[PDB]
Write an enzyme that holds these catalytic residues in place. Structure first.
Site, PDB file in Angstrom:
ATOM      1  N   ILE A  10      25.102  60.483  61.358  1.00  0.00           N
ATOM      2  CA  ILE A  10      26.227  59.741  61.919  1.00  0.00           C
ATOM      3  C   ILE A  10      26.451  58.422  61.194  1.00  0.00           C
ATOM      4  CG2 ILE A  10      27.245  58.759  63.957  1.00  0.00           C
ATOM      5  CD1 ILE A  10      25.450  60.387  65.674  1.00  0.00           C
ATOM      6  N   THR A  14      22.476  49.008  62.306  1.00  0.00           N
ATOM      7  CA  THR A  14      21.893  47.716  61.978  1.00  0.00           C
ATOM      8  C   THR A  14      20.364  47.712  62.009  1.00  0.00           C
ATOM      9  OG1 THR A  14      22.148  47.023  64.293  1.00  0.00           O
ATOM     10  CG2 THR A  14      23.920  46.446  62.759  1.00  0.00           C
ATOM     11  N   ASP A 123      25.263  41.400  69.815  1.00  0.00           N
ATOM     12  CA  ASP A 123      25.914  41.866  68.590  1.00  0.00           C
ATOM     13  C   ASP A 123      27.067  42.824  68.841  1.00  0.00           C
ATOM     14  OD1 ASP A 123      26.272  41.893  65.810  1.00  0.00           O
ATOM     15  OD2 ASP A 123      25.002  43.670  65.592  1.00  0.00           O
TER      16      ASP A 123
HETATM   17  N1  LIG Z   1      25.420  57.120  70.929  1.00  0.00           N
HETATM   18  C1  LIG Z   1      26.156  57.635  69.896  1.00  0.00           C
HETATM   19  O1  LIG Z   1      26.782  58.671  70.071  1.00  0.00           O
HETATM   20  C2  LIG Z   1      26.167  57.004  68.661  1.00  0.00           C
HETATM   21  C3  LIG Z   1      25.067  56.154  68.292  1.00  0.00           C
HETATM   22  C4  LIG Z   1      25.031  55.492  67.022  1.00  0.00           C
HETATM   23  N2  LIG Z   1      24.031  54.734  66.736  1.00  0.00           N
HETATM   24  O2  LIG Z   1      24.220  53.564  66.162  1.00  0.00           O
HETATM   25  O3  LIG Z   1      22.808  55.079  67.056  1.00  0.00           O
HETATM   26  C5  LIG Z   1      26.122  55.701  66.100  1.00  0.00           C
HETATM   27 CL1  LIG Z   1      26.169  54.975  64.539  1.00  0.00          CL
HETATM   28  C6  LIG Z   1      27.206  56.528  66.469  1.00  0.00           C
HETATM   29  C7  LIG Z   1      27.252  57.182  67.738  1.00  0.00           C
HETATM   30  N3  LIG Z   1      28.257  57.932  68.052  1.00  0.00           N
HETATM   31  C8  LIG Z   1      29.635  57.706  67.544  1.00  0.00           C
HETATM   32  C9  LIG Z   1      29.935  58.693  66.441  1.00  0.00           C
HETATM   33  C10 LIG Z   1      30.485  58.259  65.210  1.00  0.00           C
HETATM   34  C11 LIG Z   1      30.762  59.191  64.181  1.00  0.00           C
HETATM   35  C12 LIG Z   1      30.470  60.544  64.429  1.00  0.00           C
HETATM   36 CL2  LIG Z   1      30.798  61.689  63.189  1.00  0.00          CL
HETATM   37  N4  LIG Z   1      29.934  61.000  65.609  1.00  0.00           N
HETATM   38  C13 LIG Z   1      29.676  60.070  66.594  1.00  0.00           C
END
Ligand SMILES: NC(=O)c1cc([N+](=O)[O-])c(Cl)cc1NCc1ccc(Cl)nc1
Length: 294
Positions: A10, A14, A123
């Site tokens: 994904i 940070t 943040d």
């Molecule tokens: N809790 C989550 O679902 C999540 C956690 C983190 N992260 O920081 O642990 C991140 Cl970066 C993105 C997330 N989802 C959004 C997302 C964004 C792009 C794609 Cl393809 N699929 C899902």
């Protein structure tokens, strides 16, 4: 791996890399964050473990904290998109006001909850606000910054975004208060409205000066004690304050009024999440369905 089958990467937050994963057992789809470096504070894991208790509809659930192989894994409930991507996708037409208001209202509910439980985000930024097809928006990463004190950077060459940083942090205050989150959310609110970052600084001083150029260089009148702040310099240029009417057009007076209260310089004058929820701007709030393309 073990009980997780990686679906995709994904991104790289940070702290470390993030993968969408499926629990080979329960079949649940989750976001797995691998935390960077060789020891991992036992204090952190304890505080983090506390965040597992932080349950609210507008807060991304922290399902598990796994300290193994002497490295840290955070398992979060999964949401398909973040507000930064949604805003970019809505750039041509803009997010409709009813949806902007719904999101702001939900985010304030989430903050009021966290703050009432003595948990700060520290943040907040569009990339840390996740949305789903039901019209919900949730805060991601609450309390992680504290369980690690100072951020600095991600972990491997990644330009830290300062755009949403409260001025007291920029001026070297060592003790953050719930007010820093209200400031960040105010910056996000302005950005959803105008479709442009409010204070897009490219350095700590450029960030501070962009804030001063718009809200006026702060002084002892509007911010008692500001001239005694750690990084304050009497040599800061003195800029006059601009009008909100020019800062977030064409937002109405209810919106400008709430934003002005979320952007007060004095952390103590800045409106609380709880008080902001009662602002007249939310008298007609609703929960619209967003046009989300996944
Ligand atoms: N809790 C989550 O679902 C999540 C956690 C983190 N992260 O920081 O642990 C991140 Cl970066 C993105 C997330 N989802 C959004 C997302 C964004 C792009 C794609 Cl393809 N699929 C899902």
């Amino acid at each position: 791996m073990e009980n997780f089958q990686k679906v995709e990467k994904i991104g790289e937050g940070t702290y470390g890399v993030v993968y969408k994963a499926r629990n080979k057992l329960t079949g649940e789809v989750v976001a797995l964050k691998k935390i960077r470096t060789e020891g991992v504070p036992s204090t952190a894991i304890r505080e983090i473990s506390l965040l597992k208790e932080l349950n609210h509809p507008n807060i991304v659930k922290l399902l598990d904290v796994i300290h193994t192989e002497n490295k840290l894994y955070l398992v979060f409930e999964f949401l398909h998109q973040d507000l930064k991507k949604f805003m970019d996708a809505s750039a041509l037409t803009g997010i409709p006001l009813p949806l902007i208001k719904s999101y702001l209202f939900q985010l304030l509910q989430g903050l009021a909850f966290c703050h009432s439980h003595r948990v700060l985000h520290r943040d907040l930024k569009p990339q840390n606000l996740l949305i789903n097809t039901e019209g919900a928006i949730k805060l991601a990463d609450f309390g992680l910054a504290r369980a690690f004190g100072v951020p600095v950077r991600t972990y491997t060459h990644e330009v830290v975004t300062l755009w949403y940083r409260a001025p007291e942090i920029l001026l070297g205050c060592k003790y953050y208060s719930t007010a820093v989150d209200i400031w960040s959310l105010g910056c996000i609110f302005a950005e959803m409205v105008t479709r442009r970052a409010l204070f897009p600084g490219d350095s700590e001083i450029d960030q501070l000066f962009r804030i001063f150029r718009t809200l006026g260089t702060p002084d002892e009148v509007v911010w008692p004690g500001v001239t005694s702040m750690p990084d304050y310099k009497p040599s800061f240029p003195k800029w006059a304050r601009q009008d909100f009417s020019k800062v977030v057009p064409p937002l109405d007076e209810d919106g400008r009024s709430l934003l002005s209260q979320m952007l007060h310089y004095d952390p103590n004058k800045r409106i609380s999440a709880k008080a902001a929820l009662a602002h007249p701007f939310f008298q007609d709030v609703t929960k619209p369905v967003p046009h989300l393309r996944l």
